[PDB]
Amino acid sequence: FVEMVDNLRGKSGQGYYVEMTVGSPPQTLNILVDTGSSNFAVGAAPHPFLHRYYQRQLSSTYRDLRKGVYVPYTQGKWEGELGTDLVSIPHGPNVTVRANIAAITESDKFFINGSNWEGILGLAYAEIARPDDSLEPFFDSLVKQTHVPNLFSLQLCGLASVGGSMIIGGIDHSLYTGSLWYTPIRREWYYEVIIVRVEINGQDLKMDCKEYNYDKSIVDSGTTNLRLPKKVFEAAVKSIKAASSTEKFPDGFWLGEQLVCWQAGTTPWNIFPVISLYLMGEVTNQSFRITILPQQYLRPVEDVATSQDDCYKFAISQSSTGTVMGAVIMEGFYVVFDRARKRIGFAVSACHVHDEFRTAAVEGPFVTLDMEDCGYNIPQTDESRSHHHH
Ligand SMILES: CC1(C)Cc2cc(Cl)ccc2C(N[C@@H](Cc2ccccc2)c2nc(=O)c(C#N)c[nH]2)=N1
Ligand SMILES: [Zn+2]
Ligand SMILES: [Zn+2]
Ligand SMILES: [Zn+2]
Ligand SMILES: [Zn+2]
């Protein structure tokens, strides 16, 4: 898949985008790759931080669905008018499909100054599509209309410019080394997975493993940080603080709200521990671990005021909606979203993050005799229970 290698670009902390074309004649836009949502939505009216947008009036193939959609986030919102148009990925498979498109007509805190993407490609499953699951997501239309295999893979390589690859329909062996380990997709909504054990510099956090997946764990290219449920995040911060106790940092650093700096080239990486997340294996009683270096979770931020200094932001943060394996985790790894086989694969990425003495790793198997169920069952609302799925 040499045509798809290197088809991602981005800015540090503003995700990764792929080129897509919409309409006829083709209007090219840069579209955020988001495995944490399931709408394809594109800016479709002027905005101060956009200089291009989808012009439905210029597409002879555009059809209006005459139905609006409103998508709130805890940080902002976008809203728009649903329709369909022809869509292709110029640096992807050689096919064109008729897909649902939400034309974003207004938004708040969604498009950011200097980001360079004009829309978002929700790669997760219909269940979480807005306004409901009857709006077929892009990848579903892609696989149904063409012979593209039902799989995609992401190599996300670490404002600074970033790059990577989204291989659509395949796995490209040139983008990883060593073993590829698969963990099951627990349920097809988010790319939900189960973490069975967490270690910080080889020391077990020794929490009940349900705490790791409370109320879910998901793989999310739309999230920057590794985000951890409250109790886990506190135990992790306690452990990382212990390891790094030669350095007393301010509270704001541990909150993600303050940089910490050393003289250029002197950062003491050795005092910051590796973190290993052990993911359920395909075989009952087996897991494998993914091991993250501090260079993945301490993100450099170029200081405008101290040229002499290497400065970093702590990129692990607290969650109340479960564990989120964001860019912090993914940047280590070639991640295969094997929708056909309901599994997610992890191998060490060919764009490796370097530490002098340690390596981001994917290792297994680890066997447990004790097969505790580490999944959490989210309390069923009457709202969920009552909707019919015909
Ligand atoms: C998918 C996308 C665009 C959805 C989104 C919507 C809105 Cl309105 C505001 C921010 C985000 C958002 N935030 C990401 C960072 C992002 C911005 C732009 C592109 C990709 C990622 C995020 N990551 C975190 O770690 C975090 C925390 N803690 C909070 N937020 N990601
Ligand atoms: Zn507004
Ligand atoms: Zn531009
Ligand atoms: Zn019914
Ligand atoms: Zn349904």
Curated annotation (Swiss-Prot):
Species name = Homo sapiens (Human)
What family is this? Belongs to the peptidase A1 family.
Give the location in the cell.
Cell membrane; Golgi apparatus, trans-Golgi network; Endoplasmic reticulum; Endosome
Instruction: Relay the domain remarks.
Output: DXXLL motif is required for a proper endocytosis and retrograde transport to the trans-Golgi network, as well as for regulation of lysosomal degradation.
Q: How is it modified after translation?
A: N-Glycosylated. Addition of a bisecting N-acetylglucosamine by MGAT3 blocks lysosomal targeting, further degradation and is required for maintaining stability under stress conditions.
Q: Which residues form the Peptidase A1 domain?
A: 16-347
The yes or no answer to whether the keyword Disulfide bond is present is yes
Name this polypeptide is given: Beta-secretase 1
Full-protein residues shown: 60 to 453 of 501
So which residues have sugars stuck on them? 94, 113, 285
Q: Which UniProt keywords apply?
A: Acetylation, Aspartyl protease, Cell membrane, Cell projection, Cytoplasmic vesicle, Disulfide bond, Endoplasmic reticulum, Endosome, Glycoprotein, Golgi apparatus, Hydrolase, Isopeptide bond, Lipoprotein, Lysosome, Membrane, Palmitate, Phosphoprotein, Protease, Signal, Transmembrane, Transmembrane helix, Ubl conjugation, Zymogen
Give residue numbers for the modification (N6-acetyllysine).
67, 206, 210, 216, 230-231, 238
Show the catalytic activity: Broad endopeptidase specificity. Cleaves Glu-Val-Asn-Leu-|-Asp-Ala-Glu-Phe in the Swedish variant of Alzheimer's amyloid precursor protein
Q: GO:BP terms for this protein?
A: amyloid fibril formation; amyloid precursor protein catabolic process; amyloid-beta formation; amyloid-beta metabolic process; cellular response to amyloid-beta; cellular response to copper ion; cellular response to manganese ion; detection of mechanical stimulus involved in sensory perception of pain
Q: How is its activity regulated?
A: Inhibited by RTN3 and RTN4.
Report, as the record phrases it, the tissue specificity of this protein.
Expressed at high levels in the brain and pancreas. In the brain, expression is highest in the substantia nigra, locus coruleus and medulla oblongata.
Q: What is its EC number?
A: 3.4.23.46
What is known about what this protein does? Responsible for the proteolytic processing of the amyloid precursor protein (APP). Cleaves at the N-terminus of the A-beta peptide sequence, between residues 671 and 672 of APP, leads to the generation and extracellular release of beta-cleaved soluble APP, and a corresponding cell-associated C-terminal fragment which is later released by gamma-secretase. Cleaves CHL1.
